[PDB]
Amino acid sequence: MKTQVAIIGAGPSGLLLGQLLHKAGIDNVILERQTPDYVLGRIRAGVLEQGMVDLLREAGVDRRMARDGLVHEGVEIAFAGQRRRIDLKRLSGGKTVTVYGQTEVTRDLMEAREACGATTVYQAAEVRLHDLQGERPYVTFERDGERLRLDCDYIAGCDGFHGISRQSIPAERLKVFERVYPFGWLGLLADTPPVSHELIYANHPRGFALCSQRSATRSRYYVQVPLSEKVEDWSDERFWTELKARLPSEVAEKLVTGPSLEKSIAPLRSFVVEPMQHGRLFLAGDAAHIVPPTGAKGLNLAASDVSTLYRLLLKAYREGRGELLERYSAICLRRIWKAERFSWWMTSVLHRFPDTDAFSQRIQQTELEYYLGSEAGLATIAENYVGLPYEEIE
Amino acid sequence: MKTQVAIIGAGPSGLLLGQLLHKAGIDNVILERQTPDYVLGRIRAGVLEQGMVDLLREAGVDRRMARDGLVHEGVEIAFAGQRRRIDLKRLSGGKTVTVYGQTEVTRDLMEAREACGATTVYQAAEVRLHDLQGERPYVTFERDGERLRLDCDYIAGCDGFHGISRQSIPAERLKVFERVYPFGWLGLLADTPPVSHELIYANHPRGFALCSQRSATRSRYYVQVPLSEKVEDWSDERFWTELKARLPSEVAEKLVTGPSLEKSIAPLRSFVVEPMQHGRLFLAGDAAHIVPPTGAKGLNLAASDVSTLYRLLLKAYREGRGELLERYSAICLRRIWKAERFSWWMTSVLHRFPDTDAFSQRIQQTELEYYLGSEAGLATIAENYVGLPYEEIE
Numbered sequence: 060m061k062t063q064v065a066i067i068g069a070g071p072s073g074l075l076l077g078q079l080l081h082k083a084g085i086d087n088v089i090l091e092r093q094t095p096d097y098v099l100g101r102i103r104a105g106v107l108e109q110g111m112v113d114l115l116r117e118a119g120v121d122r123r124m125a126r127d128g129l130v131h132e133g134v135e136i137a138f139a140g141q142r143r144r145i146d147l148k149r150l151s152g153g154k155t156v157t158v159y160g161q162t163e164v165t166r167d168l169m170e171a172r173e174a175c176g177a178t179t180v181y182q183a184a185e186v187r188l189h190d191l192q193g194e195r196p197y198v199t200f201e202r203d204g205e206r207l208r209l210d211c212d213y214i215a216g217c218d219g220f221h222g223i224s225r226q227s228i229p230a231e232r233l234k235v236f237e238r239v240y241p242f243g244w245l246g247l248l249a250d251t252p253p254v255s256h257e258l259i260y261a262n263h264p265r266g267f268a269l270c271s272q273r274s275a276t277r278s279r280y281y282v283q284v285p286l287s288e289k290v291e292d293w294s295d296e297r298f299w300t301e302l303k304a305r306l307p308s309e310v311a312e313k314l315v316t317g318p319s320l321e322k323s324i325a326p327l328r329s330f331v332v333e334p335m336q337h338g339r340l341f342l343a344g345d346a347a348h349i350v351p352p353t354g355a356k357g358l359n360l361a362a363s364d365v366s367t368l369y370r371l372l373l374k375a376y377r378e379g380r381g382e383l384l385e386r387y388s389a390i391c392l393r394r395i396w397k398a399e400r401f402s403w404w405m406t407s408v409l410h411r412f413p414d415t416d417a418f419s420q421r422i423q424q425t426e427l428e429y430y431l432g433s434e435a436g437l438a439t440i441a442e443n444y445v446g447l448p449y450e451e452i453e
Numbered sequence: 454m455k456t457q458v459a460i461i462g463a464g465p466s467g468l469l470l471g472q473l474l475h476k477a478g479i480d481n482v483i484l485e486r487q488t489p490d491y492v493l494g495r496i497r498a499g500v501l502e503q504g505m506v507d508l509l510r511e512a513g514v515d516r517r518m519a520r521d522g523l524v525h526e527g528v529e530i531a532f533a534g535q536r537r538r539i540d541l542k543r544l545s546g547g548k549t550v551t552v553y554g555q556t557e558v559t560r561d562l563m564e565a566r567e568a569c570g571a572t573t574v575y576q577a578a579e580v581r582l583h584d585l586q587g588e589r590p591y592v593t594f595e596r597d598g599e600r601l602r603l604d605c606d607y608i609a610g611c612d613g614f615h616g617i618s619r620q621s622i623p624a625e626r627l628k629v630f631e632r633v634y635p636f637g638w639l640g641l642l643a644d645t646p647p648v649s650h651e652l653i654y655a656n657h658p659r660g661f662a663l664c665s666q667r668s669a670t671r672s673r674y675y676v677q678v679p680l681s682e683k684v685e686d687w688s689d690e691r692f693w694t695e696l697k698a699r700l701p702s703e704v705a706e707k708l709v710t711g712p713s714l715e716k717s718i719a720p721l722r723s724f725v726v727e728p729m730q731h732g733r734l735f736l737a738g739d740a741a742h743i744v745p746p747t748g749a750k751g752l753n754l755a756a757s758d759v760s761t762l763y764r765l766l767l768k769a770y771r772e773g774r775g776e777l778l779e780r781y782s783a784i785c786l787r788r789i790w791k792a793e794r795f796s797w798w799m800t801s802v803l804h805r806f807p808d809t810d811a812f813s814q815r816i817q818q819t820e821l822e823y824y825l826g827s828e829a830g831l832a833t834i835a836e837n838y839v840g841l842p843y844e845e846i847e
């Protein structure tokens with residue numbers, strides 16, 4: 060069994076890369092440990108950058124998104140009982156973000172891939188990567204019993220934080236950078252209408268809160284919770300009481316509560332591995348890095364990783380330019396570190412940290428007051444939020 | 454012995470306030486523990502904001518400064534071997550900073566005060582403040598032996614961090630905010646020409662370094678040093694070797710070294726007391742707050758404190774509006790906290806901290822890369838550096 064690009068993981072990353080590759084005639088096979096159904100169960104991302112929206116268009120998978128997506132020209136930040144709006148469009152010079160659930164994005168790429176008839180092996184057990192530094196690497200796996208082999212020229216590891224590809228690069232060749240936050244996010248998806256037509260990030264003495272959405276009849280809310288919490292400890296009622304308690308009154312007031320469709324706890328982390336490739340293995344998305352959700356950069360970085368990998372696989376294949384692939388890591392990390400720094404900054408100014416002395420508290424509040432009151436401060440938030448520009452390559 | 458405004462401390466603060474008050478006909482007496490000569494021995498500040506320069510003009514003490522001062526339209530930041538210039542003038546929309554030693558400023562106010570013949574008691578021992586909450590407070594002190602009393606209506610505590618005025622407000626009525634940095638600044642004043650016509654702030658793996666100046670034939674350099682160091686452990690030669698080692702080669706190369714005129718170690722601290730007044734006592738400058746030198750805000754905040762106190766003492770005296778003085782603290786802290794936050798940010802991105810993990814290191818470098826590469830990032834540095842605008846009052 061042979062292919063040109065073996066792809067580990069059928070998440071937004073592998074699917075998006077697989078799709079882009081297919082359009083250029085570069086054969087690829089995707090391997091997924093789970094079922095189409097499990098992958099679709101993950102809620103995750105709601106905010107998409109401009110570059111991601113255009114990338115979705117280039118892969119010809121933007122019909123439903125252009126229809127149901129919601130373009131947002133601003134986002135709000137509330138602290139000390141005062142909402143301050145950031146005009147993304149104005150401040151970024153025309154860019155905006157699009158709210159469209161990751162579940163939907165994944166669902167659209169899954170359909171586009173099935174129609175075009177490209178290979179996709181779900182429930183691919185025991186995926187193992189071999190001969191990474193050879194001229195001819197290969198992947199082995201077990202499809203419901205029998206051990207199958209798949210030869211390829213390149214492997215794109217799009218298997219996420221707990222994937223096998225990063226584990227396959229010799230530990231000694233990687234440099235890991237990581238920060239674990241002492242809190243997590245308790246998320247609740249409801250079939251009620253959102254409290255505001257725009258996202259509201261909230262810094263409150265009780266902890267962080269975020270009012271987001273998926274459509275006009277579906278909401279996604281988040282509250283900061285310590286690591287000790289177990290989701291089973293939060294009835295819907297406790298969550299609503301808590302959310303209402305962290306929001307500005309004129310907001311808590313019009314909030315339409317209702318039963319939860321999903322509730323999960325996501326702990327915050329920052330992680331970067333350098334480099335992002337080894338021999339004929341290239342890491343992408345969550346396989347290579349993790350950003351805390353505060354900045355909404357995760358899925359968005361995956362897109363630029365993929366966008367970069369695709370453009371280089373083209374040069375290498377179509378133009379017979381295989382030496383250019385040695386640049387992937389260099390090119391990606393620049394955007395990764397800026398995105399990481401932004402995500403880190405958002406998290407530090409919006410959440411409540413445990414052993415915080417009076418001076419730090421005061422500094423946190425002044426950071427908000429400053430960046431939120433200055434035209435230059437607002438612009439740094441905005442350009443980073445809409446997402447910094449992708450790099451050209453070469 | 455009576456006066457209208459008793460002033461504790463003949464530093465830039467008390468002298469500047471005393472001068473401004475005198476021009477409006479508001480009598481004041483200044484009390485200084487030291488000799489005119491000791492006060493003149495302190496080197497300290499070299500950078501002045503726009504607002505301070507104009508305030509010096511309003512007090513009619515800007516002749517020598519307009520002559521010898523140096524207006525700087527930019528400052529530089531070097532890191533990872535690359536100088537990046539910040540166009541203060543361009544980015545701030547016309548503002549600049551003026552390099553003029555604090556020794557000179559203090560010397561000019563001392564002369565202006567002696568000519569006009571206003572009272573000034575040097576070597577005022579045992580200054581003690583009484584009846585702070587009464588309608589008629591008073592100061593006691595010992596002039597070379599005899600205990601003298603001085604009645605006044607108001608007391609402006611301009612005695613610095615180790616002054617007596619802040620110690621005189623009941624500890625229970627104050628809220629202190631403080632951060633002590635695990636490093637200090639080793640400064641060296643030389644009668645050699647500066648290495649660059651503009652200040653060069655330097656982040657280097659060995660530690661922070663700063664190339665500043667006082668005139669065209671006098672330089673002031675600083676290097677970061679841990680708290681364990683004793684100044685007697687740094688020969689001039691060691692300092693030059695060290696400075697050269699932390700700078701970019703094309704800079705270390707043209708550096709003209711020479712014998713030190715002064716060498717001192719200044720530890721970094723951040724301190725704010727809230728409120729800044731008690732009864733008929735008003736704190737100003739270093740008596741009320743301390744900022745690490747990184748941002749060059751210290752002397753500059755003193756000026757706005759004084760500028761605010763003066764304008765309110767006028768309303769109260771000339772316009773018989775004494776209830777307005779209850780606003781002093783409110784008005785001052787806003788500017789103090791923004792200035793503190795800026796100073797804190799500068800310090801954190803330019804110095805090397807001890808127990809720093811790989812992720813923080815990387816974040817520090819990306820902060821520089823980002824703010825220094827973005828037009829909006831550069832603007833946040835610039836507007837804060839030239840100094841945020843003073844508030845109107847009322």
Ligand SMILES: Cc1cc2nc3c(=O)[nH]c(=O)nc-3n(C[C@H](O)[C@H](O)[C@H](O)COP(=O)(O)OP(=O)(O)OC[C@H]3O[C@@H](n4cnc5c(N)ncnc54)[C@H](O)[C@@H]3O)c2cc1C
Pocket residue numbers: 067068069070071072073090091092093098103104105106107161183186217218219220221222223224244246325343344345346352354355356357358359360361
């Ligand atoms: C609360 C939350 C909110 C977020 N909000 C945002 C936001 O609004 N905007 C934003 O940009 N980002 C946000 N994200 C991040 C975003 O969801 C992720 O970065 C994104 O899901 C990563 O895409 P991925 O394809 O790289 O990996 P994944 O989504 O994890 O998918 C990887 C796939 O590979 C599969 N796989 C794993 N191991 C193997 C194996 N060993 N063999 C074969 N297959 C394997 C997995 O089953 C999975 O299907 C958020 C994340 C969370 C949790």
Ligand SMILES: Cc1cc2nc3c(=O)[nH]c(=O)nc-3n(C[C@H](O)[C@H](O)[C@H](O)COP(=O)(O)OP(=O)(O)OC[C@H]3O[C@@H](n4cnc5c(N)ncnc54)[C@H](O)[C@@H]3O)c2cc1C
Pocket residue numbers: 461462463464465466467484485486487492497498499500501555577580611612613614615616617618638640719737738739740746748749750751752753754755
């Ligand atoms: C290395 C260094 C660099 C700096 N660089 C800058 C820079 O470029 N820009 C900037 O804006 N700031 C900078 N500063 C800060 C600036 O020097 C101070 O903020 C400023 O000196 C404070 O003015 P002040 O009058 O409030 O107090 P001080 O300068 O301390 O003077 C207070 C006076 O009151 C007197 N006094 C004290 N106790 C008593 C008493 N109990 N009775 C009577 N009199 C008393 C003292 O003797 C002293 O004369 C720097 C400081 C340092 C150390």
